UniProtKB/Swiss-Prot annotation:
Residues 419-572 form the (+)RNA virus helicase C-terminal domain. Residues 1-105 form the CV ZBD domain. A ribonucleoside 5'-triphosphate binds at G262, P263, P264, G265, T266, G267, K268, S269. The chain holds residues 5325 to 5916 of 7096 of the full protein. This is Helicase nsp13. Zn(2+) 13 binds at C50, C55, C72, H75. It comes from the Viruses. It catalyses: ATP + H2O = ADP + phosphate + H(+). Residues 237-418 form the (+)RNA virus helicase ATP-binding domain. LRR repeats lie at residues 208-228. The gene is rep. Changing R372C: In strain: Omicron/BA.2, Omicron/BA.2.12.1, Omicron/BA.2.75, Omicron/BA.4, Omicron/BA.5, Omicron/BQ.1.1, Omicron/XBB.1.5, Omicron/EG.5.1. Plays a role in viral RNA synthesis. Multi-functional protein with a zinc-binding domain in N-terminus displaying RNA and DNA duplex-unwinding activities with 5' to 3' polarity. Activity of helicase is dependent on magnesium. Binds to host TBK1 and inhibits TBK1 phosphorylation; the interaction with TBK1 decreases IRF3 phosphorylation, which leads to reduced IFN-beta production. It comes from Severe acute respiratory syndrome coronavirus 2 (2019-nCoV). Changing N248S: In strain: Omicron/BQ.1.1. Zn(2+) 11 binds at C5, C8, C26, C29.
Length: 572
């Protein structure tokens, strides 16, 4: 039990026994913690507990030292010093924010605000504590058991009594029993095995609670600015395609780390892959939280970089189908594409972390711990969607609080900004530029005259809490008959239950706003479904309308966002 203080690094024998992570706290900090919170169990070699037989005094403020032993006020010998005196807790080698991180239930937005405005070591304490709290919460849900097997994609489930039922969306991944990971959608339920298996009756499913490893590396390394490009060797022969990013690629070699804010369709993949063509000898590890973000980087690399110098790292516990054109699990290749949780312990000349709004501080820290690099480039957009915070139910998490990188991009600004959207028709670019980009995003395409908006509240029904608006889907069905070109549109809504209804009624492929992020489609049909804080989130709204290359039909519930859409209004 010999470690360093999470608040001031001072070496100590003390750990908080009431904290779920049991942080090492020094004499002067440990006191400031026990004296201000319900946390009174202090751990050393032995806990600070009354040594008198059958005594239940564990509160450090009610204990004293009797020689080399610990006793309460009722058992202490005449010659005994209190454990808590003069701003310190007795220990070898002799905070308001730490108390709030240590005691909070992570259900308030203010908990996440603090976990991002605090000191660097407190961001790791916050990130570990949050993730451990999120896992112990997965145990609170009831066990689903197979009652009947309808077919290869449908079954009926028997839930546990006394324990609540977890939300049934793709976000919540189950573990069958060890028959593989499984997912559910809406008494006929749709089952989806990450592995194909003849669903047996009696088999059960649990949300896999994974052990939270402690954090060691910071979320962001200390910034270093250099007079020249360091450890990287630029080409003089640089393809005209990537000439627009040359000044920014040099900025990347003259700093330890750099932030790139790239609104939708401004060239993030192009910038990331073009950085390899600019430093041709440099080993680049490409990382992101999701398999789809890593796969999008592989698709752009397949087009510009040699396939023999690339490798897609796939964890043996495969959950979804990912990129198959590179040699798999060769961490020895010059270009390594890998999700954060699968990263090996290696080194790199450049580390590119894409879709930075989806990262948590836990992920930022894991990347710094597994990858030791000369340069780190963080690419994403704080105006796009963050990682879901399953415990957060009160308050809204603002972009400057998503993670350390997003905090920097929203306060000091990003080091680099891609200001030209090449994907969207001008109507959409002008709407999101004013909405989330402070009028700094510019349109490359002209107005398509195929961006429509309809103010139609319809009727809101609910599959549990996931919302449906059948009259909004009815308006879409009516529109499709009059606009058959839109037969090829992707249907998007903020709710998976709305999507299930629209899939059966319209037959269009379906995507939630959160799963559509990073993807593009010629035509998009968006139904807002509700006027909630979720369906009105400006970041979700921004993602939803920036998926479209040619046209979009927005069936709106919120007068506010409807009025902001610079689209042609439709009647009915
Ligand atoms: C951080 C660089 S690395 O260790 O991942 N790649 C270098 C390398 C090492 C051994 C090899 C090889 C390439 O090809 C044959 O055997
Ligand atoms: Zn301390
Ligand atoms: Zn504590
Ligand atoms: Zn006692």
């Amino acid at each position: 039990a010999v470690g360093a203080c999470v608040l001031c690094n001072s070496q100590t024998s003390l750990r908080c026994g009431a904290c779920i992570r049991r942080p090492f706290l020094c004499c002067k900090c440990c006191y400031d913690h026990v004296i201000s919170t319900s946390h009174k169990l202090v751990l050393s070699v032995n806990p600070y507990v009354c040594n008198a037989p059958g005594c239940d005094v564990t509160d450090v403020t009610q204990l004293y030292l009797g020689g080399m032993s610990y006793y309460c006020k009722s058992h202490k010998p005449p010659i005994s010093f209190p454990l808590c005196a003069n701003g310190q807790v007795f220990g070898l080698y002799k905070v308001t924010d730490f108390n709030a991180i240590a005691t909070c239930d992570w259900t308030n937005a203010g908990d996440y605000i603090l976990a991002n405005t605090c000191t660097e070591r407190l961001k790791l304490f916050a990130a570990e504590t949050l993730k451990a709290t999120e896992e112990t919460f997965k145990l609170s849900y009831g066990i689903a058991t197979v009652r009947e097997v309808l077919s290869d994609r449908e079954l009926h489930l028997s839930w546990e009594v006394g324990k609540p039922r977890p939300p049934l969306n793709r976000n919540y991944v189950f573990t069958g029993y060890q028959i593989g990971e499984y997912t559910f959608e809406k008494d006929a339920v749709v089952y989806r095995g990450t592995t194909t298996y003849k669903l047996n009756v009696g088999d059960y499913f649990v949300l896999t609670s994974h052990t939270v490893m402690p954090l060691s590396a910071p979320t962001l390394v200390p910034q270093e600015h250099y007079v020249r490009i360091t450890g990287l060797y630029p080409t003089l022969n640089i393809s005209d395609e990537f000439s627009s990013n040359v000044a920014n690629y040099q900025k990347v070699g003259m700093q330890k780390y750099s932030t790139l804010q790239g609104p939708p369709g401004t060239g993030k993949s192009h910038f990331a892959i073009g950085l390899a063509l600019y430093y041709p000898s440099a080993r680049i590890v490409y990382t992101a939280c999701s398999h789809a973000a890593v796969d999008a980087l592989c698709e752009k690399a397949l087009k510009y970089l040699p396939i023999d110098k690339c490798s897609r790292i796939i964890p043996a516990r495969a959950r979804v189908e990912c990129f198959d054109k590179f040699k798999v699990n060769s961490t020895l290749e010059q270009y390594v594409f890998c999700t954060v949780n699968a990263l090996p312990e290696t080194t790199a000349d450049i580390v590119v972390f894409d879709e930075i709004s989806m990262a948590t501080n836990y992920d930022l820290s894991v990347v710094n711990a597994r990858l030791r690099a000369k340069h780190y480039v963080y690419i994403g957009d704080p105006a796009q969607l963050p990682a879901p915070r399953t415990l957060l139910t009160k308050g809204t998490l603002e972009p400057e609080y998503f993670n350390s990188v997003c905090r920097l991009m929203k306060t000091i600004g990003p080091d680099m900004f891609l200001g030209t959207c090449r994907r969207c028709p001008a109507e959409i670019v002008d709407t999101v530029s004013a909405l989330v980009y402070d009028n700094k995003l510019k349109a490359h395409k002209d107005k398509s005259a195929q961006c429509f908006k309809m103010f139609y509240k319809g009727v809101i029904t609910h599959d549990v809490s996931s919302a449906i608006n059948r009259p909004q889907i009815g308006v879409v069905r009516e529109f499709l008959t009059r606009n058959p070109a839109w037969r090829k549109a992707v249907f998007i809504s903020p709710y998976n239950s709305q999507n299930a209804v629209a899939s059966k009624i319209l037959g269009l492929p379906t995507q939630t706003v959160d799963s559509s992020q990073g993807s593009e489609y010629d035509y998009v049909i968006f139904t807002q479904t509700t006027e909630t804080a979720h369906s009105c989130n400006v970041n979700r709204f921004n993602v939803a309308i920036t998926r479209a290359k040619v046209g979009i039909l927005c069936i709106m519930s919120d007068r506010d966002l409807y009025d902001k859409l610079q689209f042609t209004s439709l009647e009915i």
